[PDB]
Each structure stands twice: as structure tokens, then as C-alpha cells.
Amino acid sequence: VPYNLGESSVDNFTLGELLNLTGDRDALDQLSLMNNDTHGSLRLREAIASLDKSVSPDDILVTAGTTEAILIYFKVRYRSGANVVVPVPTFHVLYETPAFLGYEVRYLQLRAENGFRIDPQELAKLVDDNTEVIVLNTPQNPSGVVCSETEIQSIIEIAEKHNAEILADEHYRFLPHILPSLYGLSPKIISLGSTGKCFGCIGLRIGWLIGNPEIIKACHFFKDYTTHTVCVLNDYIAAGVLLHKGKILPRYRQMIQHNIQQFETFIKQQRGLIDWVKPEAGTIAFPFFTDPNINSKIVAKRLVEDHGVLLLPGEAFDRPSHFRIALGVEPSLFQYALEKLAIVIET
Amino acid sequence: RVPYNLGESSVDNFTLGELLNLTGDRDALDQLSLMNNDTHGSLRLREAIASLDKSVSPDDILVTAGTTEAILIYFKVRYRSGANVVVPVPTFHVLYETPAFLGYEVRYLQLRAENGFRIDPQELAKLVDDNTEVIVLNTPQNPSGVVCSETEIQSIIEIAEKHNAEILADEHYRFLPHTEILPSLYGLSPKIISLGSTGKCFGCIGLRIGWLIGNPEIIKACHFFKDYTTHTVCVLNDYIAAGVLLHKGKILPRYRQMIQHNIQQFETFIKQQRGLIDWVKPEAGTIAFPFFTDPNINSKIVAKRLVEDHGVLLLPGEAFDRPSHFRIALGVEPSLFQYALEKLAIVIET
Ligand SMILES: [Mg+2]
Ligand SMILES: [Mg+2]
Ligand SMILES: [Mg+2]
């Protein structure tokens, strides 16, 4: 569809556009197509580590996207009778991969009436001594909510009291409306990051895991049975992306804030029919119809067939009144999408 | 990290620039969008893969990040409680260790140098029962280089079709026969799932491009579960691997030439060793699995002393539970191969 607002990545570069910003074009031809460093290249791991003082280049395992990292981590920490706590709505892999691996998945239902925020007392009611992982996706996909320092501190306290690790999916830390990594805040925190969603190069398939030496050694071992290594080419391009983030992220931040303002104007024009928890960071928002009778699936279907505008209906997150909309698109397409959405609402 | 590594199963790898000079794909890379690739792999790559055999259509192919991912996805989708897999060993460790991780009962079919590392049909039927879901068929074999004959293939198909077990045909090394490439086994029976890759044969193992070839239902099931391993492969690797296949005639003859020169060099080396060294002569692929005919020397300590004193790495046969054997790469420069043989003779003498 020409007006696709249903993705969680920003508008992607071409390879040539990206290399004109990173300067990495001439170095690519000398790269060897032998197997990459199995932890990821030092250049990429040092570029990742430079984002946070708490992170050293040896704490990092580069994976083929965070999807692979999620799989390897949950496999390593699996044991019979273990459970994972997943706040939902979130990226589906974060609860489906543990389920595939045999985990008992305990869902923490986040809701727009509570600002999609984690209540520590409701999380402590889900964590026991068999809880091995608490998933913490911040900034959140689809809400865009950033966990406050006190919510994090309460989660750290629940996790350290039950010896549960915290899987902090920090995919969207690069686009505040960068956010510091949670990796240093507690020994139980394992951090996930990626260039994909924030830098206009989701197709590079570069993610990383940050953890203590034993979880890194265990994840590195099992990666031999998923993809072995990531390509030196994607590795090298992703590293230059991070080292030149100042040529990429501010432009996307500017696009997102224009689209946030455009959606707030759209909220005023809809006069209470549309609301949202205003996002704090990332590439997406999760607005909702304030009418419990309208189903976003039927609005979205008419919008994509009659106008070619794609919004992700909230049923994909079991929130039928909501829909996710991409903020990292050109503001003209964003505004065009809202104007067609207003037409579907009016009729 | 040792400069004279003969312990790998890939051929000498290109730099990206060396490969692009052969495929002509350099100028096209800049226009590629970094959005998500086609989740089956690009049509350009799947058409290039499919063009290798009449039995293969572009819709039968799922591109993965190496065959390691395809192996994980395939065994996951086909797993059920109480299922077993039959794996001829020695073979690539992932082919039996990944099923073990997924809960399969792994039944090993010991391949043997006294039998030419060939599959015995009567010994395979004694391992396949009604609970066998997969029979692994690595041809050409890693580490032996043995190609399964036409009669061995039909006998395996008959054991598989009588117990309704699938055949996972790892055809990684079909591009380097010692015909231009070996024919795919995919069309030979509806139970055969084919795995292929450009990595080991084309000098670009680092691209991480593999593929699975199967019926529409296994493709759909594998495509679904790929969303939980890597989602998609990069459009850049996809594009380069397609050009590798479309220009295989500009790439493979050099490696075939290197391998046959090294096969001749090792045959001269066997004669110089006067019965101390033997092998099942490889028929295809990038590797050989020679052995010492002396039951007293341990190949692991020979390899240990060879790398420390000469910087030459051979893979000791203990890695395949064949202590008298060692694996040696044939897809290296013949000058480096000869250097390795001349230093291996020095370690042997003392
Ligand atoms: Mg640092
Ligand atoms: Mg516990
Ligand atoms: Mg064909």
C-alpha cells in the first residue's frame, strides 16, 4: 500500500543514501566474506558500547536482529516449570517465543486508562521464584510510553527479590520525543538494542544483547544453532550508522514531532472521538476510539481498501478500540492518512 | 585466527570487492531499499535458486540466514513428542545437535571408512521406525566428501516412504563436483526437503544465505516460524547471493581447479607417506577426511603440534569421533595446501 502507517520502523534509507551519511562505502569492498567475529565485529561492539558508560565491548553479543537475541536468551534461561512475565500490549515475539520454548507466560495487562504504565503491586502479584524473566519493553511498542525511574526501580526490586532477570527491550531508546540504557542499573538486567527501527535500516538485520559474561557465553554458544554469525557487511554498515547517529536521528526526531503535533490537531478535530496516551519515545503511537462500540478492524479495513492507507488495528494487540500508527513517516503521508481517516470516521 | 587455517569447510573466501568484480552487482547495491526484504527471499534470488533444477520452482524456496537457520526451523516445525531423527555420522554437528536441543531422540548411523563412508540400506532400515520423522541425508558429505550413489538414494527413499519419514537433504556442496553442479535431490521423491547455500562453495560463507526447498505446506510452516528466528534476511546479502548464483560460471571453475590440484597434491602426499596416510577419496565438495593407518598416533596431538610449530590448522577427527582421521580443506590455494602437507610430514617424521 502506498500509505503504510502500520509498521514500527521509520522510513528506510536506500543503501546508497545510508553510505552517503556514514562514509563507509569505500571500506566495504575490502571487507572479507569469511565468517564475522562470532560476537560481532569489534567496530560494531565498540560503537554499541560507546552509547553507555555501563557497557563495555565485551558485554555485547551481536545477533541477526533482536528477534534472534530474544530467541537465544529465552532458550538459555529456560528450565522446566519456569514462567515469564510479559507486559502486554507489546511486540508479539516477546511472549510468543517464550511460549514456543515451553515457558508459562504470565501477562501483565497494560491499559490506556492507566497510561499503559506498570503498577508495581500488580507485577509483584505475577512474579514468583519460578519467574525467570520479566520482560521490560521501554520505550513501549505500540504505546510509546517510557517507564519512569521509579517504575524501573520498583521492577528492579521485585526482580532482585525473586532472582528474576529483566529483559529490557530498548529498541526505541534512540528516538526520545538518546535514552540511557538500563544495563547498568541492576545485575539482573539484560538489555536488547538494535539499529533497525530507529535509523531507517530495519533490513540490515542487526541487533544486540548486553549481559554479564555468563549469559553472553551461554547465548554465544546457542547462537551456533540459529544463524552462527551475522554478515560482516551488515555488521560494518550498522556500526557506521551508530557512529554517525547525529546525521540520522535528529532528522527522524523532527519528523516524529511534526507527526505528533499533526495527530494532536487531529485529536482536537475529532472532538473526543479519538484519544491517546501521548507517546514519550519511539516510532509509534497507540491511539484509540473513545467509543466502546466502534471496532478499529472495520475502520482500518475501509481505510486501506478505499484509500490505500494502512493502520495496524488494535486486535493485533488484543485492544480492539486501539490502532497503531507509524510516526516516522514523511509528515505529508501522515497528514494524508489522517485526512482519509477523518473521511472514514465521518461516514 | 591462525593464518594457515585448513580446518574449515568453506573455500577461500573473497573480499566483497573481489566478489562484486565477478558478479557485476556493485552499482545496483546503492539503489536497494533497506526496508524489510521479501520474507521468502527476493524473487531474484529464488528464481536464481530455482533455475538450478527443473524440479524446483521459485515458490518452493524459503531463503534463510544460512542453512543453520533452515535446519532449526525445519526440525522445529516437524517436531512432536516421541519423534526420532536418523542422522548418519560423522556429519555437520548442527544436523544432529539441533534436533537434540529440540527434544528429538537422535539415532546415529555410524558412517565408516572401511565401508567408504557409504550408507548401508540394511543398517538404515534397522534405525528407522514409525516414530522416525526425519532422515538426514548430507550429500556431498561433510567431512568425507562422499556422494551418495543412485542406488543408495533410492534405498533411503524406500525406507523413508515405507515409514513416512521425511528426508532432509543437505546439498550444501552440490556446487563442487570433482557436470557443472550435482543435481538436486528435491524432485526425486515427495518426502525430500532440500537445503542449499552459496556459502561453502562460492567463497562467501559470511553472507549468511541459505535456503530450504520443500512442498508448499512445509514452506508455509517454516516461513511462519522464521518470524521467531530472524524474520527476514538482509536485502543486500539476498541481492549479492543471487548474483553469485547467476554468475556461478565466473566463480566455481577457479575453486574446482584449486580442489583438484590439491586432491592431486594429497595423492602425491599419500604415496610419499608409503601407507601411513590413507583416505576415502572425496567425490565432491570442499573437504577431505584422510586418516592415519597407524592405530597408535592420535590425530589431535598431531594437529596440536602442527598448529603450534607451523601455524597450520587441521581439524582433528575427534571433532567427529574419528580419532585416526583429520579434516583438511581442499578449497585453499594449492601453494598453501602444499605448505601444509610439507609441514604435516615434518610433524609426522618426529
Ligand atoms: Mg561504554
Ligand atoms: Mg527462579
Ligand atoms: Mg527450476
Author numbering:
A (entry chain A): 18 to 194, 200 to 369
B (entry chain B): 17 to 194, 198 to 369
Share the article's original sentences.
GntC catalyzes a cyclodehydration from a stereoselectively γ-hydroxylated l-arginine precursor via a reaction that functionally and mechanistically diverges from previously established actinobacterial cyclic arginine ncAA pathways. GntC initially facilitates the reversible deprotonations of the α- and β-positions of its substrate before catalyzing an irreversible diastereoselective dehydration and subsequent intramolecular cyclization. Consistent with many type I/II PLP-dependent enzymes, the GntC active site is found at the homodimer interface.
GntC crystallized as a dimer of homodimers and adopted a largely α-helical structural fold. PLP was bound to K219 in each monomer as an internal aldimine; this was consistent with sequence alignment results that suggested this lysine was responsible for anchoring the cofactor in the active site. The comparison of holo- and substrate-bound GntC structures and activity assays on site-specific mutants further identified amino acid residues that contribute to the overall catalytic mechanism.
